[PDB]
Design a protein around this ligand. Structure first.
Ligand SMILES: O=C(O)c1cccc2c1C(=O)N(Cc1c(F)cccc1Cl)C2
Ligand SMILES: [Zn+2]
Ligand SMILES: [Zn+2]
Length: 230
């Protein structure tokens, strides 16, 4: 069973096998007077691992690295953060200290700095216009356009048909819009249309927070966003 928020103490990290060579990582953090769960991705990259997103802070990200070593035992050599919020970049300094080369788009890096969050080291080229895609080892990085944030990226693992939607995609049980302070509500449905057009064969869809599903999460998110606007 996919681990839920009440099952993970703050400071612990779980790994969940999605497909051969693909895991999600699940952590929890104090936020908005509560504790929330948060997902990232781990993808086998030959003899190394590619990490998608931190585990929401330095302490959790240290626990993530320890759990990866215990359960997988291959080195994390690169990480990509999919937008500038702290659930995506908080912990990049720990990753760097562990030998991980950390990456994000130039926009994400600038936005993180202004927000006071940690800053991935390296800039990803080729992702500045909506619909841009680039290969990054065993994944494709895709910029669908503004949605939950202006900089949000999605990640596709072609060998496993896994679409990591990040925070632009809501889990099914989230039926009202969450944090829209950094969102583009008018563009978000169109950005989801771009994701659907690009990845119609996705078999697993991972949201930034909560339970994985399938491509049904895309239409669900569109419906939630539009209901907020209407
Ligand atoms: O999108 C959501 O509604 C959502 C749901 C669960 C958890 C989070 C968000 C969200 O927007 N986070 C960003 C954030 C923030 F906005 C302010 C301070 C710190 C941070 Cl990590 C965290
Ligand atoms: Zn966010
Ligand atoms: Zn988020």
């Amino acid at each position: 069973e996919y681990p839920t928020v009440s099952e993970i103490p703050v400071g612990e990290v779980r790994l969940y096998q999605i497909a051969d060579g693909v895991w999600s990582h699940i952590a929890t953090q104090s936020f908005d007077g509560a504790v929330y769960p948060s997902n990232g991705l781990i993808v086998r990259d030959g003899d190394e691992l590619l990490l998608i997103d931190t585990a929401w802070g330095a302490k959790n990200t240290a626990a993530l690295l320890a759990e990866i070593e215990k359960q997988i035992g291959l080195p994390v050599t690169r990480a990509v953060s999919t937008h500038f919020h702290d659930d995506r970049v908080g912990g990049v300094d720990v990753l760097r200290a562990a030998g991980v080369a950390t990456y994000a788009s130039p926009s994400t890096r600038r936005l993180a700095e202004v927000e006071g969050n940690e800053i991935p080291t390296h800039s990803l080229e080729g992702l500045s216009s909506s619909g841009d895609a680039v290969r990054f080892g065993p994944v494709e990085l895709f910029y669908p356009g503004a949605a939950h944030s202006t900089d949000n990226l999605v990640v596709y693992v072609p060998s496993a048909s896994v679409l990591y939607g990040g925070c632009a995609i809501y889990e099914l049980s989230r039926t009202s819009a969450g944090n829209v302070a950094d969102a583009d509500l008018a563009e978000w449905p169109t950005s989801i249309e771009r994701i659907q057009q690009h990845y119609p064969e996705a078999q697993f869809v991972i949201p930034g927070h909560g339970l994985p599903g399938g491509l049904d999460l895309l239409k669900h998110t569109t419906n939630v966003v539009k209901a907020h606007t209407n």
